[PDB]
Amino acid sequence: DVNLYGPGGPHTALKDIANKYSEKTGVKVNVNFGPQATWFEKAKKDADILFGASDQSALAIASDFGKDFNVSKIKPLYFREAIILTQKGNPLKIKGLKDLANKKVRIVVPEGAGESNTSGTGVWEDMIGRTQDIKTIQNFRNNIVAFVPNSGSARKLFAQDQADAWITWIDWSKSNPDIGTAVAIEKDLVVYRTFNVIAKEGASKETQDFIAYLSSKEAKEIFKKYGWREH
Amino acid sequence: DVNLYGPGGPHTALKDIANKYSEKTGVKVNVNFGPQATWFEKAKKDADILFGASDQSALAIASDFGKDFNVSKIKPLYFREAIILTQKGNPLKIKGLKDLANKKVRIVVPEGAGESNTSGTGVWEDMIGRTQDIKTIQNFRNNIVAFVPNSGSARKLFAQDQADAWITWIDWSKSNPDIGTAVAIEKDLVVYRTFNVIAKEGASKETQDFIAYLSSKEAKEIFKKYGWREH
């Protein structure tokens, strides 16, 4: 029983992979996911691995288990870019972040307001801040209608009938080709955040083997299918 | 009397501005500063204005005050860039972030591990992730000796005779000109975060008028002295 816990989002890629690893080697690999609160008590008892959707959020969650995990051992394996997700078909013809600042649009950004550890913290501001123009930053912010954590493993999008755009991650789109239209953020503005994992202290050899599988050729191509990169 | 509460860092520019405002108008402006827990209690009683050193941190701090502050009213006014602070004279010859990834160095980064609301959360990863190389990202993380909130109001770095490099903000270097050697981060990698203010619901006109002064020609120039920019 190789048990994994982390946020919704990368779970889809990790379930493909755990599916494979199970029928190939017989090792039962469980992928637990969602908001930290919904699986904390459970994982407090049996987490083998914690996986994460950014470094800051991984650091914060692993620090919540005390002696069980040594946050020094967090391992970044892949990265992926932030995206703009619009309404299907992109009717407002949004071309990038600057466009979101300039038009009368309604933006939702992935902030948790110190209420939970989430992968989106600091993302919107680090991208728009790279315009180095205070008016644009001000304009972008005045168009923000909601500061809510990334929907992650939920298929529902906050304010999905009211908002015009969401700052989110490519992998969410890849996993839900269904919802919205992805728009590429300017290259000189965009940020990339990592997928990581950490093995518990004592990690059985069964665990260490799965972690290594995550860098194998089969795992790499699955991760790549969801927009997770290495180079 | 106008009572301000917020993190160390922007406080040096603000004490200046406040002194100059008092000189002119005869209004008493108090600048309280430091980690949130050290003044949270006093603020819950008399805060007229919360000031912030990034958007995510300001949002999180203002949300702690319940109804007293409406978080939609947060106002970005200035930005500044992150920097590398090395030991005096830069004896390891650090040239930028990629250099910090490649050399043997001890780096301290401004993360609060979900245990505090701090300006630096997400900064180091957003900068090094723009290299779009997982090994570099990896090598950088492996040189980090401490994840601790920015020193802010302390004229003292964490482990300041121990670490080789701190990821910090220009305004810190500006405020502590005799400590360490500032090294500029690659333009294609660096992130910029904002100064911001918010008034309590029901802010007096006295309070509103000081906020207006933060954008006057005189304030602009004090802010610029400590590294805060608009364009």
Automatic annotation (TrEMBL), chains A, B:
<feature type="binding site">
    <location>
        <position position="151"/>
    </location>
    <ligand>
        <name>(2R)-3-phosphoglycerate</name>
    </ligand>
</feature>
<comment type="similarity">
    <text>Belongs to the prokaryotic sulfate-binding protein family.</text>
</comment>
<dbReference type="GO" id="GO:0140104">
    <property type="term" value="F:molecular carrier activity"/>
</dbReference>
<feature type="binding site">
    <location>
        <position position="119"/>
    </location>
    <ligand>
        <name>(2R)-3-phosphoglycerate</name>
    </ligand>
</feature>
<keyword id="KW-0732">Signal</keyword>
<keyword id="KW-0574">Periplasm</keyword>
<dbReference type="GO" id="GO:1902358">
    <property type="term" value="P:sulfate transmembrane transport"/>
</dbReference>
<protein>
    <submittedName>
        <fullName>Major antigenic peptide PEB3</fullName>
    </submittedName>
</protein>
<feature type="binding site">
    <location>
        <position position="118"/>
    </location>
    <ligand>
        <name>(2R)-3-phosphoglycerate</name>
    </ligand>
</feature>
<keyword id="KW-0813">Transport</keyword>
<feature type="binding site">
    <location>
        <position position="8"/>
    </location>
    <ligand>
        <name>(2R)-3-phosphoglycerate</name>
    </ligand>
</feature>
<dbReference type="GO" id="GO:0042597">
    <property type="term" value="C:periplasmic space"/>
</dbReference>
<dbReference type="Pfam" id="PF13531">
    <property type="entry name" value="SBP_bac_11"/>
</dbReference>
<feature type="binding site">
    <location>
        <position position="152"/>
    </location>
    <ligand>
        <name>(2R)-3-phosphoglycerate</name>
    </ligand>
</feature>
<dbReference type="InterPro" id="IPR005669">
    <property type="entry name" value="Thiosulph/SO4-bd"/>
</dbReference>
